[PDB]
PDB file of C-alpha atoms in Angstrom:
ATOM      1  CA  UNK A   1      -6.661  27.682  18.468  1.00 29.13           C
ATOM      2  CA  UNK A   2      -9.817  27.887  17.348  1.00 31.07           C
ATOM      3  CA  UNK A   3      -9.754  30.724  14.600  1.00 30.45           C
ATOM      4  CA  UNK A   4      -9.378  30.070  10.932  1.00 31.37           C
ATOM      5  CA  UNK A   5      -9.102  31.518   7.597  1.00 33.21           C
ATOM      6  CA  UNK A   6     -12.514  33.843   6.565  1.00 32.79           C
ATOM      7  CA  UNK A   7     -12.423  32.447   3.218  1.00 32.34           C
ATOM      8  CA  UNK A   8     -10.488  29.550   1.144  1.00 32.30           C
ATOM      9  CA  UNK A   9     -10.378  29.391  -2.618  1.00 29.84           C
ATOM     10  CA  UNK A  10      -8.612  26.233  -2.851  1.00 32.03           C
ATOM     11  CA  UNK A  11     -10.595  23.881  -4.628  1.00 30.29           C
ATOM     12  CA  UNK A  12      -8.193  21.957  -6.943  1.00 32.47           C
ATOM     13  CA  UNK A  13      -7.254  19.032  -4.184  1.00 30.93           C
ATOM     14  CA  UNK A  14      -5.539  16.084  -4.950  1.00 32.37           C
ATOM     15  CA  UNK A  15      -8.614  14.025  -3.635  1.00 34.28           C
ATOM     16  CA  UNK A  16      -8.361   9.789  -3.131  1.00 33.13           C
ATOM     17  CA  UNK A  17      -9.771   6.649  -2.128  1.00 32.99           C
ATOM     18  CA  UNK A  18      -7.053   4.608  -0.918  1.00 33.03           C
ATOM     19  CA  UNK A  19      -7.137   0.984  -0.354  1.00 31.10           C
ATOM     20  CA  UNK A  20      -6.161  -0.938   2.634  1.00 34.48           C
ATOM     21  CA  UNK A  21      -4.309  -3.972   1.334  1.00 32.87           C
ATOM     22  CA  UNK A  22      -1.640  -2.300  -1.371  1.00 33.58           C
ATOM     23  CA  UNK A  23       1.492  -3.148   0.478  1.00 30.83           C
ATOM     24  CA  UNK A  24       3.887  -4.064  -2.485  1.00 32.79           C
ATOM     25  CA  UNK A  25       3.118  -3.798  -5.885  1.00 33.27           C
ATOM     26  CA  UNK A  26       4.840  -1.319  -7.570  1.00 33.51           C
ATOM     27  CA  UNK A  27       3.053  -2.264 -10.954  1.00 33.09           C
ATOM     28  CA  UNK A  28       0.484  -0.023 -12.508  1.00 33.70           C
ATOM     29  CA  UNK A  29      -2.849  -2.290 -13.099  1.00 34.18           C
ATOM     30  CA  UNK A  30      -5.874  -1.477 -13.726  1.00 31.19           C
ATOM     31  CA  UNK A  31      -7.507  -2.965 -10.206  1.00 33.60           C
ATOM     32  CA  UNK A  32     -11.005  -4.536 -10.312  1.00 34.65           C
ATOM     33  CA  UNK A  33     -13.604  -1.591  -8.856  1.00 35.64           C
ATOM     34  CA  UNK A  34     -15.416  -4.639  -7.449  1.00 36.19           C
ATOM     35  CA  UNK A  35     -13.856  -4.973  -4.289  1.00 38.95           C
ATOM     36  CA  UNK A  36     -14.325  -1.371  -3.193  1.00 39.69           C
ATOM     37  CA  UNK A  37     -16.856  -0.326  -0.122  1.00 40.00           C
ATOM     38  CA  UNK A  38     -16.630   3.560  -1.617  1.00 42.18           C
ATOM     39  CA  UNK A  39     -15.841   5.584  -4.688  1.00 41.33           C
ATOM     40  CA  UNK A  40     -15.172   9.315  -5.171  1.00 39.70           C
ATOM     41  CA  UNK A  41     -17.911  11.181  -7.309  1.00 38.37           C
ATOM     42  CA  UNK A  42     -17.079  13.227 -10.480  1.00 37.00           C
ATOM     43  CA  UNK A  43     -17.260  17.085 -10.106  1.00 39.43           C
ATOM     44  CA  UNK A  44     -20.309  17.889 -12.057  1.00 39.74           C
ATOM     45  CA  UNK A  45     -19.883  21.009 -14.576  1.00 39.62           C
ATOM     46  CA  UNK A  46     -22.859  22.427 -13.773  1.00 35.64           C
ATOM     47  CA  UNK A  47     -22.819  26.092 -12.496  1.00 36.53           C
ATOM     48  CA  UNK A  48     -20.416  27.526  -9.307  1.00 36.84           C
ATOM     49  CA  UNK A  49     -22.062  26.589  -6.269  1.00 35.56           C
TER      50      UNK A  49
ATOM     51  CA  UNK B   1       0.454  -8.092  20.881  1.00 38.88           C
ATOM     52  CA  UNK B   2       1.226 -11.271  19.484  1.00 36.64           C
ATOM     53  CA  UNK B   3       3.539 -11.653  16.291  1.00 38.80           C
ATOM     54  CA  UNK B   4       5.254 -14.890  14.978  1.00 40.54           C
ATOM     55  CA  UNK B   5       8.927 -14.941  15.858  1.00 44.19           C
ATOM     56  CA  UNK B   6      10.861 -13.925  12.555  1.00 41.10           C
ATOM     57  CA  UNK B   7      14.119 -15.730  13.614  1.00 39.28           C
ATOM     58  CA  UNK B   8      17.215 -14.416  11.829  1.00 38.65           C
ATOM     59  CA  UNK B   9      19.181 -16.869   9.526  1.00 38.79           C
ATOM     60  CA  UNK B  10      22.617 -17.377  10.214  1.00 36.09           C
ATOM     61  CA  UNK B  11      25.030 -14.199   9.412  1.00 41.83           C
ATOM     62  CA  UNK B  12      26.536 -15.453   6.016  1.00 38.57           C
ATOM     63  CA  UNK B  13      29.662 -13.129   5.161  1.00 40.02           C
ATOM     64  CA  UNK B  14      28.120 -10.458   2.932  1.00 37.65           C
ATOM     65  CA  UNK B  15      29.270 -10.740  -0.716  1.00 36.09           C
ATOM     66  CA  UNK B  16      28.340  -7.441  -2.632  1.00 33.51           C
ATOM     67  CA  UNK B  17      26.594  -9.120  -5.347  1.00 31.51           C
ATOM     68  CA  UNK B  18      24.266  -6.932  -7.112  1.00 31.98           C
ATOM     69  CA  UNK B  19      22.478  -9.728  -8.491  1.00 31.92           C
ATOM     70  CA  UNK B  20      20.555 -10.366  -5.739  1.00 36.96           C
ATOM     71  CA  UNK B  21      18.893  -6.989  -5.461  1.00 36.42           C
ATOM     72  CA  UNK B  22      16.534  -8.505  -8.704  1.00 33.94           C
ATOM     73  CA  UNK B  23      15.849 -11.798  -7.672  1.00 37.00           C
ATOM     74  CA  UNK B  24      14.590 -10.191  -4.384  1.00 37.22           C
ATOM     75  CA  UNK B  25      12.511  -7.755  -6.695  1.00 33.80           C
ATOM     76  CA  UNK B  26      11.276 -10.783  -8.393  1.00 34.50           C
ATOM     77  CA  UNK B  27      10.237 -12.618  -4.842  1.00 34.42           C
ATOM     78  CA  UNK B  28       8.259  -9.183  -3.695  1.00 33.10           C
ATOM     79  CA  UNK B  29       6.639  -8.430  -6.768  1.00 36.16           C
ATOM     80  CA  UNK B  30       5.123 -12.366  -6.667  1.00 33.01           C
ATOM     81  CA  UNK B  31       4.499 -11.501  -2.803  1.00 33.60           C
ATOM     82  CA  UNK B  32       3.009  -8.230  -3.741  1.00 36.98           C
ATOM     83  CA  UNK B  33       0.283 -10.069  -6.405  1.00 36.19           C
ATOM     84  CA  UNK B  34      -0.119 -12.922  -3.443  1.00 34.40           C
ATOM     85  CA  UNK B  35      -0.910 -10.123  -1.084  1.00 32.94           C
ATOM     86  CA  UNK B  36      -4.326  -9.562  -3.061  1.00 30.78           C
ATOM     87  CA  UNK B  37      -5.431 -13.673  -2.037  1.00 26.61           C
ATOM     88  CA  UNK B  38      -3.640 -14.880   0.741  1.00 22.69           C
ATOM     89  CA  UNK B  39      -4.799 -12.597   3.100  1.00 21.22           C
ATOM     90  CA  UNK B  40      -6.017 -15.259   5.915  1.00 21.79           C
ATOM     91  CA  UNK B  41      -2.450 -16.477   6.651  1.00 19.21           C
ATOM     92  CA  UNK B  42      -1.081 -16.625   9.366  1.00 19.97           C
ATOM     93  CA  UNK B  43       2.062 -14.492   7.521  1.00 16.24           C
ATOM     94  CA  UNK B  44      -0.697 -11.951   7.116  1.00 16.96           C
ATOM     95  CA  UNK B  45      -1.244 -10.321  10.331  1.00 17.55           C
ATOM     96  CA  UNK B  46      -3.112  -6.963  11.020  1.00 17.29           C
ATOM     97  CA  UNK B  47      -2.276  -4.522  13.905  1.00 17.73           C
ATOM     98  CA  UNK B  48      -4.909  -5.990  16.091  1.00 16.50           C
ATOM     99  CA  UNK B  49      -7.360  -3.673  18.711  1.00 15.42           C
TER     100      UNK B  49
END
């Protein structure tokens, strides 16, 4: 506890926003981005940081 | 917390009817849309702090 990994190439993550009120629907709409308080940002392809 | 008191219905002998499984499908997908709106019910409780 308290050592980690000296370096992680890993970059690849299935990143999400998830939304708080999705309890049933099984159904696969394209929801309003309206209602949102966040969104993720695109990855630009500019050079490796 | 407080919760509203979900009685049981009376214990009907269970016929094996597969039929049912859809028209229950068909009530939760309806339930699932009405999720998005009816959010201030009373049959729409959040976990309370």
């Amino acid at each position: 506890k308290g050592v980690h990994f000296d370096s992680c190439n890993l970059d690849d993550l299935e990143w999400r926003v998830d939304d708080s009120n999705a309890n049933n629907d099984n159904n696969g709409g394209g929801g309003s981005n309206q209602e949102r308080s966040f969104s993720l940002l695109p990855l630009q392809k500019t050079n490796t940081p | 917390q407080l919760q509203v008191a979900n009685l049981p219905k009376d214990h009907q002998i269970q016929d094996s009817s597969h039929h049912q499984q859809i028209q229950q499908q068909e009530q939760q997908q309806q339930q699932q849309q009405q999720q998005s709106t009816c959010q201030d019910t009373i049959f729409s409780i959040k976990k309370q702090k």
